Amino acid sequence: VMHREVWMAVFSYLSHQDLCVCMRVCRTWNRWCCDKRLWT
Amino acid sequence: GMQIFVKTFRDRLRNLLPQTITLEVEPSDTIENVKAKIQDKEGIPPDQQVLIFSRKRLEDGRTLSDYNIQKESTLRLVLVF
Amino acid sequence: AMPSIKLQSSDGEIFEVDVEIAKQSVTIKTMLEDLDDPVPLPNVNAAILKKVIQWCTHHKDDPPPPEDDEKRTDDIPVWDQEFLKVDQGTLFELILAANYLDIKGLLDVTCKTVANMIKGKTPEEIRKTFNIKNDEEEEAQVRKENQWCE
Asked: Where are the domains of chain B?
């Protein structure tokens, strides 16, 4: 939840396998994690 | 009618570099009006804008003449959540 | 003695700080280089500003920071993990304050800290740490789609 720009900063420190876990946490996180720049 | 400049800082959580914009204002105009004009130009609602001139935080209900904001002066603006 | 600058927290408290400590905040350092009064700080209260001043005196000899890039998280110095052994609200309040005052070094460690609180846990174990509710048929669809990826 909370603010989106805060969470993308932390998400950018996560591997592909770490990011794999976060799209099942909540609905808003799943939408946030479909940004292709995170899997760079 | 008069022209003033508003300059941002670097905001890393957004991806914004410092930059300056121009506004058309009146000395009578309230800080609430100027924030409304800033939303008009860049889409930032007032609840996320803090404007500063001469190391004084500009309060919403007051005017630019109350801070002696004149032609070509420059306000700085921090973005908050 | 020392050249000093005055900061005013958002709740109104004055802090007097060394120039070299305060200039670690690029926002503070920038609004001093355009032309006695205390510098207003946006939505940084006294309690969070107190933490920020602690971090900046420790890092006062750090150079101006360079742009990134590849981001790791095993590299948080020992002093900054002990400094951030803090309640989680202030941790986020510190992310915001580092953003508003443009202190790259503190924005990096704090975001990495939260990321270590995610690395390895699972959606249930993560939800309980930041009290986020799970919004059974929906979950199975994403669980299948993101199985092959990672």
From this structure: 1-81
